[PDB]
Structure 1
Amino acid sequence: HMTPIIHLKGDRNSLKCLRYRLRKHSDHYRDISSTWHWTEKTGILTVTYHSETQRTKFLNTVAIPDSVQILVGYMT
Structure 2
Amino acid sequence: TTPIVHLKGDANTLKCLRYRFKKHCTLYTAVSSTWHWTAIVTLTYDSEWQRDQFLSQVKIPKTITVSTGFMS
TM score, norm. by length of structure 2 = 0.91
Q: State the identity %.
A: 57
Write the distance in 2 (CA, Å) between the matches of 1:61 and 1:20. Answer: 15
Runs of 4+ in 1 over 4 A off after TM superposition: none
SS of the residue aligned with 1:50? coil
Give 2:66's aligned residue. 70
- Cα deviation for residue 29 of structure 1 reads 0.5
Q: Which runs of 5+ in 2 are unaligned?
A: none
What is the Cα-based RMSD across aligned positions, in Å?
Answer: 1.0
1:1-76 equivalences in 2 (<5 Å): 2-39=1-38, 43-76=39-72
TM-score of the superposed pair, with normalisation by structure 1:
0.87
**Equivalences, count:** 72
Q: Report if aligned partners of 1:7, 1:44 keep a CA contact under 8 Å in 2.
A: yes
The Cα shift of 1:49 comes to 0.2
Write the deviation string for residues 23-55 of structure 1: whole angstroms up to 9, x where unpaired: 12200100110111110xxx0010100111100
